[PDB]
Design an enzyme around this catalytic site. Structure first.
Site, PDB file in Angstrom:
ATOM      1  N   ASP A 291     -95.334   2.980 -41.293  1.00  0.00           N
ATOM      2  CA  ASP A 291     -94.420   4.040 -41.717  1.00  0.00           C
ATOM      3  C   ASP A 291     -93.053   3.462 -42.047  1.00  0.00           C
ATOM      4  O   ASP A 291     -92.019   4.099 -41.825  1.00  0.00           O
ATOM      5  CB  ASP A 291     -94.319   5.118 -40.635  1.00  0.00           C
ATOM      6  CG  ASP A 291     -93.806   6.444 -41.156  1.00  0.00           C
ATOM      7  OD1 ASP A 291     -93.729   6.645 -42.387  1.00  0.00           O
ATOM      8  OD2 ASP A 291     -93.481   7.294 -40.302  1.00  0.00           O
TER       9      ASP A 291
ATOM     10  N   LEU B  63     -81.018  16.016 -33.775  1.00  0.00           N
ATOM     11  CA  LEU B  63     -80.876  14.862 -34.660  1.00  0.00           C
ATOM     12  C   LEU B  63     -81.905  14.791 -35.778  1.00  0.00           C
ATOM     13  O   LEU B  63     -81.582  14.323 -36.874  1.00  0.00           O
ATOM     14  CB  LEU B  63     -80.961  13.559 -33.854  1.00  0.00           C
ATOM     15  CG  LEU B  63     -79.861  13.299 -32.832  1.00  0.00           C
ATOM     16  CD1 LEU B  63     -80.161  11.975 -32.146  1.00  0.00           C
ATOM     17  CD2 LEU B  63     -78.494  13.278 -33.471  1.00  0.00           C
ATOM     18  N   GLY B  64     -83.144  15.200 -35.535  1.00  0.00           N
ATOM     19  CA  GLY B  64     -84.156  15.085 -36.566  1.00  0.00           C
ATOM     20  C   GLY B  64     -85.490  15.649 -36.143  1.00  0.00           C
ATOM     21  O   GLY B  64     -85.996  15.312 -35.069  1.00  0.00           O
TER      22      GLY B  64
ATOM     23  N   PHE C  20     -94.458  17.165 -36.388  1.00  0.00           N
ATOM     24  CA  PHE C  20     -95.117  16.700 -35.177  1.00  0.00           C
ATOM     25  C   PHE C  20     -94.187  16.041 -34.168  1.00  0.00           C
ATOM     26  O   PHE C  20     -94.664  15.582 -33.125  1.00  0.00           O
ATOM     27  CB  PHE C  20     -96.238  15.706 -35.526  1.00  0.00           C
ATOM     28  CG  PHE C  20     -97.341  16.296 -36.360  1.00  0.00           C
ATOM     29  CD1 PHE C  20     -98.287  17.132 -35.792  1.00  0.00           C
ATOM     30  CD2 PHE C  20     -97.442  15.998 -37.708  1.00  0.00           C
ATOM     31  CE1 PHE C  20     -99.306  17.668 -36.556  1.00  0.00           C
ATOM     32  CE2 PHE C  20     -98.457  16.531 -38.476  1.00  0.00           C
ATOM     33  CZ  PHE C  20     -99.392  17.366 -37.900  1.00  0.00           C
ATOM     34  N   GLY C  21     -92.889  15.981 -34.441  1.00  0.00           N
ATOM     35  CA  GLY C  21     -91.956  15.355 -33.526  1.00  0.00           C
ATOM     36  C   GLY C  21     -90.545  15.811 -33.790  1.00  0.00           C
ATOM     37  O   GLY C  21     -90.242  16.382 -34.847  1.00  0.00           O
ATOM     38  N   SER C  22     -89.676  15.558 -32.814  1.00  0.00           N
ATOM     39  CA  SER C  22     -88.267  15.915 -32.876  1.00  0.00           C
ATOM     40  C   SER C  22     -87.500  14.896 -32.047  1.00  0.00           C
ATOM     41  O   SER C  22     -88.028  14.360 -31.069  1.00  0.00           O
ATOM     42  CB  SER C  22     -88.018  17.333 -32.348  1.00  0.00           C
ATOM     43  OG  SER C  22     -86.651  17.692 -32.453  1.00  0.00           O
TER      44      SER C  22
HETATM   45  N1  LIG Z   1     -85.892   6.557 -37.100  1.00  0.00           N
HETATM   46  C1  LIG Z   1     -86.154   7.632 -37.527  1.00  0.00           C
HETATM   47  C2  LIG Z   1     -86.297   9.070 -38.050  1.00  0.00           C
HETATM   48  C3  LIG Z   1     -86.386  10.098 -36.881  1.00  0.00           C
HETATM   49  N2  LIG Z   1     -84.999  10.125 -36.226  1.00  0.00           N
HETATM   50  C4  LIG Z   1     -84.604   9.248 -35.227  1.00  0.00           C
HETATM   51  C5  LIG Z   1     -83.270   9.541 -34.880  1.00  0.00           C
HETATM   52  C6  LIG Z   1     -82.382   8.814 -33.889  1.00  0.00           C
HETATM   53  N3  LIG Z   1     -81.056   8.962 -34.125  1.00  0.00           N
HETATM   54  C7  LIG Z   1     -80.164   8.279 -33.305  1.00  0.00           C
HETATM   55  N4  LIG Z   1     -80.515   7.457 -32.293  1.00  0.00           N
HETATM   56  C8  LIG Z   1     -81.870   7.263 -32.043  1.00  0.00           C
HETATM   57  N5  LIG Z   1     -82.558   6.472 -31.069  1.00  0.00           N
HETATM   58  C9  LIG Z   1     -83.944   6.645 -31.261  1.00  0.00           C
HETATM   59  C10 LIG Z   1     -84.137   7.512 -32.316  1.00  0.00           C
HETATM   60  C11 LIG Z   1     -82.856   7.929 -32.842  1.00  0.00           C
HETATM   61  C12 LIG Z   1     -82.880  10.590 -35.800  1.00  0.00           C
HETATM   62  N6  LIG Z   1     -83.931  10.938 -36.601  1.00  0.00           N
HETATM   63  C13 LIG Z   1     -86.972  11.442 -37.397  1.00  0.00           C
HETATM   64  N7  LIG Z   1     -88.227  11.030 -36.778  1.00  0.00           N
HETATM   65  C14 LIG Z   1     -88.693  12.133 -35.916  1.00  0.00           C
HETATM   66  C15 LIG Z   1     -88.880  13.597 -36.475  1.00  0.00           C
HETATM   67  C16 LIG Z   1     -89.886  13.544 -37.577  1.00  0.00           C
HETATM   68  N8  LIG Z   1     -91.215  12.970 -37.252  1.00  0.00           N
HETATM   69  C17 LIG Z   1     -92.467  13.721 -37.255  1.00  0.00           C
HETATM   70  O1  LIG Z   1     -92.508  14.901 -37.600  1.00  0.00           O
HETATM   71  C18 LIG Z   1     -93.860  13.040 -36.882  1.00  0.00           C
HETATM   72  C19 LIG Z   1     -94.874  12.862 -37.853  1.00  0.00           C
HETATM   73  C20 LIG Z   1     -96.110  12.250 -37.523  1.00  0.00           C
HETATM   74  N9  LIG Z   1     -96.364  11.813 -36.271  1.00  0.00           N
HETATM   75  C21 LIG Z   1     -95.408  11.964 -35.304  1.00  0.00           C
HETATM   76  C22 LIG Z   1     -95.750  11.432 -33.838  1.00  0.00           C
HETATM   77  F1  LIG Z   1     -95.533  12.404 -32.930  1.00  0.00           F
HETATM   78  F2  LIG Z   1     -97.026  11.023 -33.753  1.00  0.00           F
HETATM   79  F3  LIG Z   1     -94.949  10.406 -33.497  1.00  0.00           F
HETATM   80  C23 LIG Z   1     -94.139  12.568 -35.546  1.00  0.00           C
HETATM   81  F4  LIG Z   1     -93.256  12.678 -34.555  1.00  0.00           F
HETATM   82  C24 LIG Z   1     -90.927  11.526 -36.840  1.00  0.00           C
HETATM   83  C25 LIG Z   1     -90.085  11.431 -35.601  1.00  0.00           C
HETATM   84  C26 LIG Z   1     -87.594   9.898 -35.946  1.00  0.00           C
END
Ligand SMILES: N#CCC1(n2cc(-c3ncnc4[nH]ccc34)cn2)CN(C2CCN(C(=O)c3ccnc(C(F)(F)F)c3F)CC2)C1
Length: 293
Positions: free
Chosen positions: A137, A16-17, A21-23
């Site tokens: 954020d 999904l994304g 630092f995260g997925s």
């Molecule tokens: N909302 C939103 C966008 C996101 N997403 C969430 C769904 C979804 N889709 C359908 N149902 C759902 N239910 C719950 C979520 C969800 C799809 N895409 C992309 N985001 C992830 C990847 C990129 N990220 C870092 O690289 C990152 C950068 C800095 N710190 C951190 C840490 F680890 F500290 F947290 C990181 F993870 C941020 C986390 C969440």
């Protein structure tokens, strides 16, 4: 509870994304192995470290403490890798991020819907403020769409808890920073508060009404104003100078003046003069309610 979501019953469905630092992935939790079960979203770290897993633990506690119609639902944790790792289990919202939805589904979006999404985001943020959580954020990329009628704040990876005696959090280990959503005092003093979340909400409202036309994104628009040639810290230097002297994102094409005015009030360099999320939710719902019908 390490038995609530056991790694062997958590089945992959879709990526999904992902970021540095995260997925997040779509999975099915099928304890009966009968091809049924509920669909869930699973967040996991990327490039993990001891320090990041400690933060991820804080993130998980934060989300677990939140129950609100406009906050993505916490479901549990999976202690995977034989209970030597951590994954966060959340409800799955099927239309993805608001940023993508605005681009992919313009056919079902009008100004009324935009205001409804605006209202819902503000109400979720009102709630966070009652916990003294600072999101840090806020952007349409971190808002999720359950359906045409509901959005939820979807990620809390940068969220901080205010000190018991202060109204701001001073970040002393800055990493990846979304500078084009940052309040000036966050850029210049590393200070984050409810009021800097309101600043960022102003940018969210801009995003909504640009409909995510790639040339109108905040990074693209700010870089145009700063100079696309610029690179490195010089970008930050010019961004700070621009904001401190009233440089702002332009009013989007077709944006009502009244909505632009809300944006500009959120973008007040005077922290204390920014409206509250309660002010904003009431103001927006009164705009909606004052229409005919
Ligand atoms: N909302 C939103 C966008 C996101 N997403 C969430 C769904 C979804 N889709 C359908 N149902 C759902 N239910 C719950 C979520 C969800 C799809 N895409 C992309 N985001 C992830 C990847 C990129 N990220 C870092 O690289 C990152 C950068 C800095 N710190 C951190 C840490 F680890 F500290 F947290 C990181 F993870 C941020 C986390 C969440």
């Amino acid at each position: 509870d390490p038995t609530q979501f056991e790694e062997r019953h958590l089945k992959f469905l879709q990526q999904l994304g992902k970021g540095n630092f995260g997925s997040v992935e779509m999975c099915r939790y099928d304890p009966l192995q009968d091809n049924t079960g509920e669909v869930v979203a699973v967040k996991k770290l990327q490039h993990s470290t001891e320090e990041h897993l400690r933060d991820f633990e804080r993130e998980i506690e934060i989300l677990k403490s939140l129950q609100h119609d406009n906050i993505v639902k916490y479901k549990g944790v999976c202690y995977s890798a034989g209970r030597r790792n951590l994954k966060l289990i959340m409800e799955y919202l099927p239309y993805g991020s608001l940023r993508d939805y605005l681009q992919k589904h313009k056919e079902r979006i009008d100004h009324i819907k935009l205001l409804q999404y605006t209202s819902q985001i503000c109400k979720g943020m009102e709630y966070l403020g009652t916990k003294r959580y600072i999101h840090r954020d806020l952007a349409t990329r971190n808002i999720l769409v359950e359906n045409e009628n509901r959005v939820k704040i979807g990620d809390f990876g940068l969220t901080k808890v205010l000190p018991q005696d202060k109204e701001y959090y001073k970040v002393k280990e800055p990493g990846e920073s979304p500078i084009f959503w940052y309040a000036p005092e966050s850029l210049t003093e590393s200070k984050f508060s409810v009021a800097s979340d309101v600043w960022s909400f102003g940018v969210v409202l801009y995003e909504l009404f640009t409909y995510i036309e790639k040339s109108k994104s905040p990074p693209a628009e700010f870089m145009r104003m700063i100079g696309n040639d610029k690179q490195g810290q010089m970008i930050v230097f010019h961004l700070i100078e621009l904001l401190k002297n009233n440089g702002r994102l332009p009013r989007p094409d077709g944006c009502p003046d009244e909505i632009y005015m809300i944006m500009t009030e959120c973008w007040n360099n005077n922290v204390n003069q920014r409206p509250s999320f309660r002010d904003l939710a009431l103001r927006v719902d009164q705009i909606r309610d004052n229409m005919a019908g």
